[PDB]
């Protein structure tokens, strides 16, 4: 008839058998969820980075 | 119709006071906590004797009532009706419950067993700790043996183990008997009723100059 | 609840805020030539009895009131449906409440 309802017994052991790994912190996070206005201006800046290349290389030289 | 006190001796549950959640609590057996000449001044009864539990347990209100009656009768017999003042220092604030079962030859008669087993308020008990005072008697200094005997007799109405201790405090105050006299002399203490008011050396000087006047 | 018979709200055809007449939406009559009705009639014809479930376990006591808005622009009679929360008593353009008045004795 009746039976056990809930437990977390042995659950921690199951969790730690393969380790509780943190998320893989990797360079260049995704731009998901960033403000769209800021993102579109960022895209415009990236697009127009091409101009001023001669000035950039002159300064570098 | 009361269960034996062995069924509620121990402090097994969390405190369960009579509140807006626990309703329908019957009144406690003990309603009077102070007996004897309660109006006696502080210097009238210099000797104080306490009865102190050695166990962490629950004392029932009926047990407190019985011990109070026994101690009162012995104190009235020995020291007279105006020669002592007793104070019970335990109040039955913890409600003990009962899961009432039918005492008939039938379990089919909607007994339900342990289903919905939360009980109805049976009574009230007082929780006492190790080193906590249960009763206090203040009287003349020459009635020390009578106080000890009254508390010894009252011990038999309680489940656990209790000790009788003649306190160093003056009466029911919190100040030592040896320092009490000179503190009153230098007006660090002002008597009122059965207690003393401690007068610290801070505050307005008007309160200082109403004294010494 | 009470809602006024007119409101100034966005009109998708005009593209701006316009006055709208507000009515209560009622479910229209069944077509009898809708595809599901035709399929149901074909299924029910013949022997076999009832071939689709009949609900008969009603639990809700209210419905979500649907407001039919109609733009008052003569050239734009566009209509829209707004649903409001469930209510038991709904009225259109009832007597607006006052604050400092006497309740009937």
């Amino acid at each position: 008839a009746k039976s056990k309802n809930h437990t977390t017994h042995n659950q921690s052991r199951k969790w730690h058998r393969n380790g509780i790994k943190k998320p893989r912190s990797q360079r260049y996070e995704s731009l998901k969820g960033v403000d769209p206005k800021f993102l579109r201006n960022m895209r415009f800046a990236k697009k127009h980075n091409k101009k001023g290349l001669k000035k950039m290389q002159a300064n570098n030289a | 119709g009361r269960r034996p006190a062995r069924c509620y001796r121990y402090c097994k549950n969390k405190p369960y006071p009579k509140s807006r959640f626990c309703r329908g609590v019957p009144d406690a057996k003990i309603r009077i906590f102070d007996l004897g000449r309660k109006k006696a001044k502080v210097d009238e009864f210099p000797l104080g004797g306490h009865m102190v539990s050695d166990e962490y347990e629950q004392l029932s209100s009926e047990a407190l009532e019985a011990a109070r009656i026994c101690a009162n009768k012995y104190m009235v017999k020995s020291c007279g009706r105006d020669g002592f003042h007793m104070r019970v220092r335990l109040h039955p604030f913890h409600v003990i419950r009962i899961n009432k079962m039918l005492s008939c030859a039938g379990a089919d008669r909607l007994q339900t067993g342990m289903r919905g087993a939360f009980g109805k308020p049976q009574g009230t008990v007082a929780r006492v700790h190790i080193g906590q005072v249960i009763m206090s008697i203040r009287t003349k200094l020459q009635n020390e043996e009578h106080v000890i005997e009254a508390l010894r007799r009252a011990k038999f109405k309680f489940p656990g183990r209790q000790k009788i201790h003649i306190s160093k405090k003056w009466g029911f105050t919190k100040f030592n008997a040896d320092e009490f006299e000179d503190m009153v002399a230098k007006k660090c203490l002002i008597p009122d009723g059965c207690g003393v008011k401690y007068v610290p050396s801070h505050g307005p000087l008007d309160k200082w100059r109403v004294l010494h006047s | 609840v009470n809602v006024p018979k007119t409101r100034r709200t966005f009109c998708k055809k005009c593209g701006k805020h316009q006055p709208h007449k507000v009515t209560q939406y009622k479910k229209g009559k069944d077509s009898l030539y809708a595809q599901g009705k035709r399929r149901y009639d074909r299924k029910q014809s013949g022997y076999g009895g009832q071939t689709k479930p009949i609900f008969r376990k009603k639990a809700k006591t209210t419905k979500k009131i649907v407001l039919r808005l109609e733009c008052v622009e003569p050239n734009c009679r566009s209509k829209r449906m707004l649903a409001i929360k469930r209510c038991k008593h709904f009225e259109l353009g009832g007597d607006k409440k006052r604050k400092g008045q006497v309740i009937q004795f």
Partner: protein, 159 residues
């Protein structure tokens, strides 16, 4: 049998401290949060908008997005046997800067200064901080005073 309400059990978590109710002080709004800096999520209850969930109260994350009134925070949350980096939008009332990060950047700057100075002046200096070492040998003078003899006191029942 527990409810799944968003604010169940937050009775003291989101309550204000004693005698600190009322107007929110404005320096909290005046703080500047850039992308990439480390913030602690607290969650005061005077402001009900943009509140973090109770599982992020007391956690610490990194700001990835800044809006007019809130920030986007990447904060680690442990769920069963895995940790996942949740992204939450939290109004700036419920966050504050992380002094751990502040002290670490201060230490980095000071270490770089020491490196430059020590390369200028030749002598090598220690930068890696060490754990507490064992105590070195030392002399304890009595100053012509005999140390006090201590004995345990006799027992007596007080109260």
């Amino acid at each position: 049998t527990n409810t799944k309400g968003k604010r169940r059990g937050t009775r003291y978590m989101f309550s204000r401290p004693f005698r600190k109710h009322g107007v929110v002080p404005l320096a909290t709004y005046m703080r500047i949060y850039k992308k990439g800096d480390i913030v602690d999520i607290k969650g005061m209850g005077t402001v009900q908008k943009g509140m973090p969930h109770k599982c992020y109260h007391g956690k610490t994350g990194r700001v990835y997005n800044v809006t007019q009134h809130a920030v986007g925070i990447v904060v680690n949350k442990q769920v069963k046997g895995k940790i996942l980096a949740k992204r939450i939008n939290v109004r700036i009332e419920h966050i504050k800067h992380s002094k751990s990060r502040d002290s670490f950047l201060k230490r980095v700057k000071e270490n770089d200064q020491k490196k430059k100075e020590a390369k200028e002046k030749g002598t090598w200096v220690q930068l890696k901080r060490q754990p507490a070492p064992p105590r070195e040998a030392h002399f304890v003078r009595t100053n012509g005073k005999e140390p006090e003899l201590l004995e345990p006191i006799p027992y007596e029942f007080m109260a």
